[PDB]
C-alpha cells in the first residue's frame, strides 16, 4: 500500500512546487484578480 502512497507523495510534491503558477490560471478563470 506504500507504493501507491509514494505515487501520491510525488504528485503532491509536483503541485506544491507550482502552486503559485496554477493559482493564477484558476483565478483568471474564476475572474478573481484585483487589478
Amino acid at each position: 500500500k506504500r507504493s501507491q502512497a509514494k505515487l501520491r507523495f510525488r504528485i503532491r510534491q509536483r503541485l506544491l512546487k507550482f502552486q503559485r503558477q496554477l493559482a493564477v490560471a484558476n483565478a483568471i478563470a474564476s475572474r478573481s484578480v484585483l487589478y
Binding site: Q19, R20, A23, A27, V33, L34
Partner: peptide, 27 residues
C-alpha cells in the same frame, strides 16, 4: 517568474485552491 507575481494579487478564498488549508503549503 512572471506568473508567481500574481499570487499575492488573488483573493484569499481561491488562492490555495487544490488544498483546503494554506498552512501546510510550501513556504
Amino acid at each position: 517568474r512572471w506568473a508567481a507575481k500574481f499570487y499575492g494579487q488573488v483573493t484569499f478564498g481561491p488562492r490555495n485552491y487544490p488544498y483546503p488549508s494554506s498552512r501546510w503549503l510550501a513556504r
